[PDB]
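Deliverable D2.4 — example input (structure tokens):
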């Protein structure tokens, strides 16, 4: 018995047919024409020949990308928050514009952390293909997700740390287990949950506007501090559906010093993030050819239970980027009645979130994009200035 993902002709496919072969429908995607199915191993040739079946992919593994670093009854500002020039922005916005949410697909959250809890707008889990809103399912069993969320969104108060966007609503989408391992099927159901939001229903309404749409509860940002080595059609499809809904996608480069990013970081519609240290040196583990980079060594942030921890990885850089896009779109929307388009890796203008990230980044190492830093270290305050000006 294996779990498999079947891409399909919606108008020629009958889901009950898998049952006649020892099969079970786990989840049917609403936004992509695919089904998550458990079948017998010997039954895979049968499934391929069934009506409406276009492709059968196997279910791969993605992993967490942050680990223990090297390395006060008060609030510390982590260095990395200062590196990306977040504090100065907070008098124009802290991200608490009501139509903006950042989705973080990870290991879950310590949902009642004193320094987090006022920003957890939704706490979900898609572990094992089962979407669960129960609090023992959505709870962080590892620590990692709690850490990445505190980096985007830790409350500005007199305890703990402070996030890049310390007023932003966060959706915590548990797609990784207690060991920070997750499967590609749970992770694509994660992206879809982040596009459907709480009420369960992409658009909603009309319209056909999803992200930045004040009647939707779709996220405007999907954050992935995770990576895998497989390239699967259905996962990249899902990626495309988020991008198409006008959602910015951000993912860790990978921690193997490999010559390129992991998946989904490597897709053209995702922002790959590499990791710098506090001396502006690229992390040695950082996978290359990222889109931008951000702090990712000796990162202090929230951690269960109701506590704090220092980690490193491109998993840590990633949420600094996600915070910066939250501040861009919250600022942009607070001034206009709308959000910027996502844009592309080749954008060098004001008119796109990605082009904004590109042109306002602190350009390190060789002039221009390079394989260590991408376009550079990302700066909230120049970015937002470019957003609004
Ligand atoms: Ca929204
Ligand atoms: Ca705090
Ligand atoms: Ca919705
Ligand atoms: Ca609307
Ligand atoms: Ca707790
Ligand atoms: Ca450069």
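Example output (designed residues):
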């Amino acid at each position: 018995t294996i779990r498999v993902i079947v891409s399909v002709d919606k108008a020629k496919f009958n889901p009950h047919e898998v049952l006649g072969i020892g099969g079970h429908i786990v989840y049917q995607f609403k936004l992509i024409p695919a089904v998550v199915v458990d079948v017998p191993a010997n039954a895979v040739g049968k499934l391929k020949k069934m009506p409406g079946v276009e492709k059968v992919e196997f279910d791969h593994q993605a992993v967490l990308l942050g680990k223990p670093s090297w390395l006060q009854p008060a609030q510390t500002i982590p260095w990395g928050i200062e590196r990306v020039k977040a504090p100065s922005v907070w008098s124009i916005t802290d991200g608490s514009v009501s139509v903006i949410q950042v989705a973080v697909l990870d290991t879950g959250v310590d949902y009642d952390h004193p320094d987090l809890a006022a920003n957890i707008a939704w706490c979900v889990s898609t572990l094992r293909g089962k979407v669960s809103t129960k609090l023992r399912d959505c709870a962080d069993q590892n620590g990692h997700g709690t850490h990445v969320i505190g980096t985007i969104a830790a409350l500005n108060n007199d305890i703990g740390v402070v996030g890049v966007a310390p007023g932003v609503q966060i959706y915590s989408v548990r797609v990784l287990d207690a060991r920070g391992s997750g499967s590609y099927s749970d992770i694509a159901i994660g992206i879809e949950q982040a596009i459907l939001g709480p009420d369960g229903v992409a658009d909603k309404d009309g319209d056909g506007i999803i992200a930045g749409d004040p009647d939707a509860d779709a996220a405007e940002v999907i954050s992935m501090s995770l990576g895998g080595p497989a390239d699967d059609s259905y996962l990249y499809d899902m990626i495309i559906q988020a991008y198409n809904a006008g959602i910015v996608i951000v993912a860790a480069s990978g921690n193997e010093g490999a010559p390129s990013p992991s998946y989904p970081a490597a897709y053209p519609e995702v922002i790959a993030v590499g990791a710098i240290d506090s001396n502006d040196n690229i992390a040695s583990f950082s996978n290359r050819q990222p889109e931008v980079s951000a702090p990712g060594v000796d990162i202090l942030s929230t951690y269960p239970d109701d506590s704090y921890e220092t980690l490193m990885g491109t998993a840590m850089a990633t949420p600094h980027v996600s915070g910066v896009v939250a501040l861009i779109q919250a600022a942009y929307y607070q001034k206009y009645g709308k959000i910027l388009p996502v844009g592309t890796f080749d954008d060098i203008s004001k008119n796109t979130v990605r082009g904004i990230l590109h042109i306002t980044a602190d350009d390190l190492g060789p002039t221009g994009w390079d394989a260590d830093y991408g376009y550079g270290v990302v700066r909230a305050a120049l970015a937002v200035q470019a957003a609004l000006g």
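Residues 24 and 38 are 5 Å apart (CA to CA).
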